[PDB]
Amino acid sequence: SEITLGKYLFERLKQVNVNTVFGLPGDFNLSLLDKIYEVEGMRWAGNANELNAAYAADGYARIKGMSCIITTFGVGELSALNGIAGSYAEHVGVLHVVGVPSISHHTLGNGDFTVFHRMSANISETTAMITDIATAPAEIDRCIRTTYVTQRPVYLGLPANLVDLNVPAKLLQTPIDMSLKPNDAESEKEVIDTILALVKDAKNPVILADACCSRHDVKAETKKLIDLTQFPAFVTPMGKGSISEQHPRYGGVYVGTLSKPEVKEAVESADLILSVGALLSDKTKNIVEFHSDHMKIRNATFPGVQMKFVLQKLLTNIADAAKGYKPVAVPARTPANAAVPASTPLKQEWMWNQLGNFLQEGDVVIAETGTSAFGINQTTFPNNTYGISQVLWGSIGFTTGATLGAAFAAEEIDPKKRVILFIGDGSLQLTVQEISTMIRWGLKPYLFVLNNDGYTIEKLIHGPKAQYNEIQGWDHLSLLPTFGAKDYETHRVATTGEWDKLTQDKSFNDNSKIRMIEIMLPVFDAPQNLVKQAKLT
Amino acid sequence: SEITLGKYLFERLKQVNVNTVFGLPGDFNLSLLDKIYEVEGMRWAGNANELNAAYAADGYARIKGMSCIITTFGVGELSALNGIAGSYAEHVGVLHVVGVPSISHHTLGNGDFTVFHRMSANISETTAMITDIATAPAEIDRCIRTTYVTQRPVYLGLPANLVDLNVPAKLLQTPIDMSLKPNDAESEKEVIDTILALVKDAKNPVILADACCSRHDVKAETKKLIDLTQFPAFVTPMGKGSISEQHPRYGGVYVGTLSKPEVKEAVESADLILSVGALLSDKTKNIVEFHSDHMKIRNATFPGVQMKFVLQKLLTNIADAAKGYKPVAVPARTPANAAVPASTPLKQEWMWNQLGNFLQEGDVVIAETGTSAFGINQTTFPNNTYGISQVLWGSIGFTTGATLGAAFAAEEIDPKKRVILFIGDGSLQLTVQEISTMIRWGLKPYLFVLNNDGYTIEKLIHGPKAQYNEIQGWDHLSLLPTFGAKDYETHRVATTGEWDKLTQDKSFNDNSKIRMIEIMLPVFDAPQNLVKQAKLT
């Protein structure tokens, strides 16, 4: 038995639990897409654009562990670049497959077939341009391993001619080894003895779980770490959802000066900060920084020491190192909103506190860069809730695509999980057509649109009335029907009373259909803290 | 007297006639953005996205001579690249200005601030990172001239801190030299002379005008060449609109073996070809290639001999060298469709033939990659018709953004110049949000949407009923209102009779409001030409 190189890929993909592929068909990927339908459990999303396809793979990747997007030579691959750059910046393993001329139009007129390939080489961990079938399987295996292991995008260029040549089916019987290289014995020992040492001498140690806490596997090792030690644990905004917000040792989200004052202090008064997975913004004492391929203790750098090993080892001796610890109280959780008349115009501060009431365990919460990403940091999540916020890259159309990707993976995990989006009126415009793909597949997300008439976040820092910070007003509610939706629901909310009425409805809380909920907000309204700093800034 | 570097940029643009600026605001471009408002007659489009705005910037240039797109570091720039590559491949003068962090987040997290610049350099004629106000003005002036003169994209990184820095206002009173340099005389002579000689011996000469005849401003000279020689004139697809088609010595669209038979015959049988050509993507040995920077006479290349002056100079002598040419019969125009009952379903073939009748002088015709770029070649254009067809880059979606741009340019040339767009339903999906911007500015293009339920060009090549060839079915007549159009018109045509009643209607022929026309076409229907090329694709 043989299999085509093309089916081979989808089969391996399925081995790593990639069931949905993103991208758009083109002149050089057609023969390869045919293969998707010869493998069971696999489906082609049929995205509305390549940039949007890149964004979805990213989101799906964030939920499932990896993703795949197929594009065509030039036109398709160059449109995805901003998505792949953001996956690269934030550590999302996205495998980007591109169909290329037949080892032989959508060219810069110069005869150069490697330009695009070399452009991507800048935002990838590794690149493969496949030219021989005898080497293909290994090559493909290699790109999948890398994407998955490093949680970085890989470019896999695949000529149209080779997708059709046969490869031994036998190859698939041997799984791709995803196991890491051990560390330098002497430096991993150095790091381990030193941490245990710091721990034994710290009176007020704190744990901070960042961005990569969960992408890099360590979410489990991080929760074990909390229980064993009993130190107060905090998430930074990129790590929100990494720690179950209902854990007694859960102390809050640490943003710097934007934090709730009691949170800011609890972290800042700490004599040891244990930091897991920084893409760090962050008096603050001795900081042990844990990164997937390096540690840092204080000012010292141990290049090459992977956190996985250090963390599996620490767990056998931490309870002991720490048995001298006297639990410190954690900052009390922000109290419920005061009762106000139902007429009360919606304000974000009210809203973000208020939202926590709507959320349930297993929710997928996506927040777009704008005042949306700032406000979500104020929402107390139930346990087992995943947060998505593109704080480092910060590409405004991101989330419409992320939501599709995330919904597709949720659907594969448990059709009962909910996908909630919080996106600004201005950002919805960059990537609106992706709502089309959700409808096509019967995905049922909650799309909340912050209608505040333009870009309030840039207005808060420069040109409150600069024409460039305004946009064409859209009739948001007609989006669903314009894109051929069938089973849907739209809603408008402008007051406290309306939020409640709809968010407390039992049918509402059920993901029976795709829904759009327009939120009416004042142009200059944002989370409190952001207005104080923004003003005097 | 001093002006800020930011305002100098806009002043110099005003001076080169770039009156509309494409792009999106962001982190690194706001103070620049503010200068646009201080310069009288200048305007900021406010695009729905960066891909879109590139597409738009390309559109504008095609009509006006050059254009300018303003983006932001990382996120803005990476998103425009498919657009910019597109301009590179087809020789379109786009100055991409990117606003970057001061000489010192939307980063790859590695502290490389030269990465995006490095990616742009492969699809740029020249690049510039401004770091000194001593030379800044000189850099800017240079970049604009290159964009202009080469008709190729240019990348200008402009650090946020420098934008507000002062410059002698006096530098503006001296105009950038936007003029081509005069040829080396001896070489120029050599060419002229042999051209003249060879013209004198040809019994059947032919003139062919390709992409660059339009792109590189030789439009007017080619025309007068045809009048003065009375040699048959043929265009290629990229060059359609390059020759005024109601000219008695104009014989058709040459597209090789796929050309109307007598078109093959008339061209193939020439004993001399004056290719007022372009982009060398390719009877006798007797070929004269005219190129923006060089000439080729048979096997003899003359580096640095610019067709512009060869042509001008040839017009002072050519008719004489030809006084003895007995004019060969030019191939016949295809006859008008035979009258059919009102009720006949529309067919593409009857359609492109008939369009020739609604079409008027000075119109802007945009036809998107799919059946539309194919069918347009079968349409007879009035004289002075500007056509836009991305034959070489072929990025579906391009047209929506370019329509925005062509329209801003068309309004600057003359408010009564009509802009007509043929886009497939598949393609619209990719750049749909750009209709918003059109509505924002009260622009009045004709948006024709070929509804044929999917990607019929693609289906006709591979997998007729493959799921990847199908689209989510949208309600197109709702787009205008959904994007907030107040004054517009929508229409749907499915028969010959409907086509006609609409297209002959006097108030419909006047660009009074923005209109959308859905064309109802059968799935597998395509122009005779795609029906022939297809075999082999």
Ligand SMILES: Cc1ncc(C[n+]2csc(CCOP(=O)(O)OP(=O)(O)O)c2C)c(N)n1
């Ligand atoms: C692709 C891209 N272009 C430009 C920017 C710059 N930018 C940052 S936030 C923003 C406005 C987003 O506004 P909206 O979604 O309405 O959020 P709000 O603050 O109003 O809730 C813009 C244009 C960006 N981040 N990404």
Ligand SMILES: Cc1ncc(C[n+]2csc(CCOP(=O)(O)OP(=O)(O)O)c2C)c(N)n1
């Ligand atoms: C950005 C990009 N993605 C993919 C392609 C490949 N592609 C070429 S034609 C086509 C379908 C065009 O569909 P439509 O506009 O519906 O045309 P028609 O039905 O008139 O043929 C696609 C997906 C491309 N050229 N550019």
Ligand SMILES: [Mg+2]
């Ligand atoms: Mg907004």
Ligand SMILES: [Mg+2]
């Ligand atoms: Mg179609």
